[PDB]
Design a protein around this ligand. Sequence first.
Ligand code: HEM
Ligand code: HEM
Ligand code: HEM
Ligand code: HEM
Ligand SMILES: O=Nc1ccccc1
Ligand SMILES: O=Nc1ccccc1
Ligand SMILES: O=Nc1ccccc1
Ligand SMILES: O=Nc1ccccc1
Ligand SMILES: O=Nc1ccccc1
Lengths: 141, 141, 143, 143
Amino acid sequence: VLSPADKTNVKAAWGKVGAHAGEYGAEALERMFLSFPTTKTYFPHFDLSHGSAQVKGHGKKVADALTNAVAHVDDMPNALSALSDLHAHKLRVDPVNFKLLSHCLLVTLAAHLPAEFTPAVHASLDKFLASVSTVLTSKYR
Amino acid sequence: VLSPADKTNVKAAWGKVGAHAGEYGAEALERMFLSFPTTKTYFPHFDLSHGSAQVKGHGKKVADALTNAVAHVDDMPNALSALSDLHAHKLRVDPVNFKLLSHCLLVTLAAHLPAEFTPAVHASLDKFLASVSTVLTSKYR
Amino acid sequence: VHLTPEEKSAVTALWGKVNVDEVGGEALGRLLVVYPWTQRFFESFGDLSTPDAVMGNPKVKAHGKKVLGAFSDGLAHLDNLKGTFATLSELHCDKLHVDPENFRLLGNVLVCVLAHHFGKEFTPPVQAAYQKVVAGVANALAH
Amino acid sequence: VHLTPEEKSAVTALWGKVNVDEVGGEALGRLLVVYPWTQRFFESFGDLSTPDAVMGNPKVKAHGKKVLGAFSDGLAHLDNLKGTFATLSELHCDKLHVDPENFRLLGNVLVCVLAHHFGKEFTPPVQAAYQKVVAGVANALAH
Ligand code: HEM
Ligand code: HEM
Ligand code: HEM
Ligand code: HEM
Ligand SMILES: O=Nc1ccccc1
Ligand SMILES: O=Nc1ccccc1
Ligand SMILES: O=Nc1ccccc1
Ligand SMILES: O=Nc1ccccc1
Ligand SMILES: O=Nc1ccccc1
């Protein structure tokens, strides 16, 4: 379970992210597609080139979903219910891929928030993203 | 979340395990120590030889913990609370090692329950053991 | 990988008794049932609707034979698994380029299936020898 | 591993600017903070009781230098990582025989630290090249 200090650390880092949330999501996705090219197979219909409006729009969706989880951090299974069914039951995403995206989200925050990404906040953000990943992988059939 | 069919499947397999629960736990541990020798480093003070009374006794403790989880399958964070603190906080068990023991528990049930270990029951038992493993790894600091 | 002589013996003697027409389909099929995202790797294989449907699918059963064949080839060339499997991975284009973890999952399902079929004979030392082989074949096939 | 020339360039140019006295300690230290079970592997290293303590521990910082050294050795011999690291693993007796996942965790913490220290310069293509190297060094060091 996330501690009070984890919840504070996550909310603080999102606060500092501010309105860049959408752009950082897009960047995390691009980092994922280049570093871990097997993840591109879930997006065969997207243009994955740099500056792609489709990656930009999808990165905003992902960031908005993370923010919803942040905003309902003690009710994440209910809040993410529809997205868990989509990823696990409909799209059949390999659960390994959530570790890869979480890593790329961390790298993105580190590359934009040098002061905020202390070891303690890094540990809190990792725990939070692993909790989101656990929810999104909870409904395989 | 475990489904009603998972809960029935797990309880049915435990039912057929019956009083062999303790011996099967010991067997799973031996399987884990031989197959994955890094796990022995958590038991440097045990005699790990075949037939070891220390492995037999510990296997009964592990089976009894799993049976407690089965018996309180909708309250597993509370029921396993003391054991999560022991494994994560005090012993600092690498979380990979729970996947290894879970695998060896499955192999043990398969080797003793040829009729019960259908594909559907196999999937239910895997899900159950992963849920236990998630609880036992939940309290790292 | 290097197996000791008793390890090689443990693998070889039980492997000679495996029903090579069914054990592969059982393992590949249980992979799809227990780890449902693996069905996406096999969209070209037809109906994978239910456990009963997965287990009965003929292309599952056919590629199951092929998985055992890959195991036997591995046991035959344990000291050069990459040279054994190079043409096997390449003939698939990018079909084998999934996370190495899924090859470890298949190998461990195979182990569960061998325990299921051999019971007491699949002793802990026998399992440990097979775990060495399935780990090496997983690493080479994922390269 | 094989790196393209652009990938080799992406790694080499940024690697030349790394503070070799600090970045290793920061990555090794964050490993122990973020994944607390890794402290068990370094119980011989003294006080690892809090983030600040971990990050200031002198043997953390010292072996952190050695982690970068292993990266530099790897980058210098990408086509024979096992021959590069054979002496390194063997001089350690059993100390490096932990799950390969922890070497992948270390490599990804190092990536996070490089992103932290280089900001915008640690572009997505630069990260992708580093991920190839840290994956190769991880596989060899766990062998
Ligand atoms: C932090 C983890 C994740 C979050 C918060 C997240 C969030 C979302 C959201 C909000 C959507 C809906 C987009 C829309 O309705 O327009 C979506 C869809 C999708 N997700 Fe994820 N996702 C995550 C992880 C992943 C991963 C790791 C993969 C695969 C590598 C993946 C693959 C997909 C795909 C293929 C779609 C459908 C894309 C399309 O065709 O429009 N997701 N996700
Ligand atoms: C299904 C997962 C597990 C269950 C249900 C479980 C259960 C238990 C229980 C009940 C005890 C207490 C024994 C006692 O107080 O006498 C214990 C202790 C212990 N566990 Fe586990 N355990 C699990 C997984 C693991 C794994 C994967 C490891 C390491 C590879 C591990 C290492 C230990 C150790 C070292 C102790 C202390 C042993 C001693 O010194 O007596 N456990 N566990
Ligand atoms: C996962 C481990 C796999 C192994 C060990 C394996 C093994 C093999 C082997 C040995 C062949 C050579 C033909 C033969 O000897 O009969 C082959 C061919 C082939 N494989 Fe696989 N395979 C695997 C996965 C897959 C996957 C995921 C696909 C995706 C559809 C696939 C599709 C094919 C196709 C289309 C052929 C050509 C012959 C045919 O089936 O029509 N295989 N495979
Ligand atoms: C995790 C990756 C590790 C790497 C890459 C690494 C690297 C090295 C290198 C390069 C050397 C000797 C040459 C030199 O200092 O330049 C060395 C020696 C040594 N290492 Fe490690 N090491 C690692 C982990 C560990 C661990 C986990 C331990 C102990 C728990 C350890 C303990 C030692 C000791 C005791 C020595 C030699 C005596 C000394 O210098 O105090 N190392 N290591
Ligand atoms: O983010 N920087 C950019 C790089 C190339 C084109 C546009 C933007
Ligand atoms: O031994 N047969 C295997 C095939 C694929 C992955 C792992 C094992
Ligand atoms: O995609 N190839 C596979 C790898 C491991 C198991 C099954 C399929
Ligand atoms: O390249 N540096 C690494 C050292 C140890 C493990 C992984 C990466
Ligand atoms: O084997 N020792 C390790 C220590 C830290 C990270 C990875 C491996």
